[PDB]
């Protein structure tokens, strides 16, 4: 039960981590949308992405580990 | 950027899907938390939901930017 959940969520952890990395690489190529690679707006996008992504990964890892710890 | 746009929508879609999976799995546990560890898990949930809502929000802002730049570039 809570063990199941925790295991499914680990898969999510890995998948989402990978997708956030893909999204970061994509942004690199979309840079024109904010004025190009030398744009402060683009730089801002990338810092926001890094931060949002890191929090998500962090929260996710926490979730997986807490959920397993509970079921214990 | 034109072609990168499709790939980003794909990534965004995959992320939202994975996030929906976590929310669904976690939601199926809303009942059953008990003890101090349960309190911890509930808090872990809320933290994830806040992080995931910020991610989703971000994905939408980025997609809008890309669409609006596309129009401009067209
Ligand atoms: Zn992939
Ligand atoms: Zn990574
Ligand atoms: Zn690409
Ligand atoms: Zn997919």
Author numbering:
A (entry chain B): 10 to 81
B (entry chain A): 11 to 84
Which lines from the publication concern this structure?
WXG100 proteins are a group of proteins of approximately ∼100 residues in length that contain a conserved “Trp-Xaa-Gly (WXG)” motif. To investigate how specific sequence motifs translate into specific structural features, we determined the atomic structures of two representative complexes, the heterodimeric CFP-10/ESAT-6 complex and the homodimeric sagEsxA assembly. The overall structures of the two protein complexes are similar, with both forming a four-helix bundle, in which each monomer consists of a helix-loop-helix structural motif. However, the novelty of this contribution is that by using the iterative bio-informatics approach, we can show that the WXG100 protein superfamily can be divided into three subfamilies: CFP-10-, ESAT-6- and sagEsxA-like.
For example, the NMR structure of the CFP-10/ESAT-6 complex shows a heterodimeric four-helix bundle with flexible termini. More recently, we solved the X-ray structure of the same complex (CFP-10/ESAT-6). In contrast to the solution structure, the X-ray structure shows better ordered termini which adopt extended α-helical structures. In CFP-10, the WXG containing loop (residues 39–45) is three residues shorter than the corresponding loop of ESAT-6 (residues 39–48). In addition, it contains a 310-helix with hydrogen bonds originating only from main chain atoms, whereas, the loop of sagEsxA (residues 43–48) consists only of a single tight β-turn. The side chain of Y51 is located at the interface between the α1 and α2 helices of ESAT-6 where it forms an inter-helical hydrogen bond with the hydroxyl group of T37 and an intra-helical hydrogen bond with the side chain amide group of Q55. In particular, the indole ring of the conserved W43 is oriented towards two helices and together with Y51, W43 blocks the top interface of the helices α1 and α2. In addition, the WXG-motif of ESAT-6 forms an extended hydrogen-bonding network, where the main chain amine groups of W43-G44-G45 form hydrogen bonds to the main chain carbonyl groups of A40 and A41. In contrast, the WXG loop of ESAT-6 adopts a more rigid conformation due to the extensive hydrogen bond contacts. A FRET signal could only be detected in those samples where donor-CFP-10 was mixed with acceptor-ESAT-6 or vice versa. These results demonstrate that CFP-10 and ESAT-6 exclusively form heterodimer and that heterodimer formation is a spontaneous process.
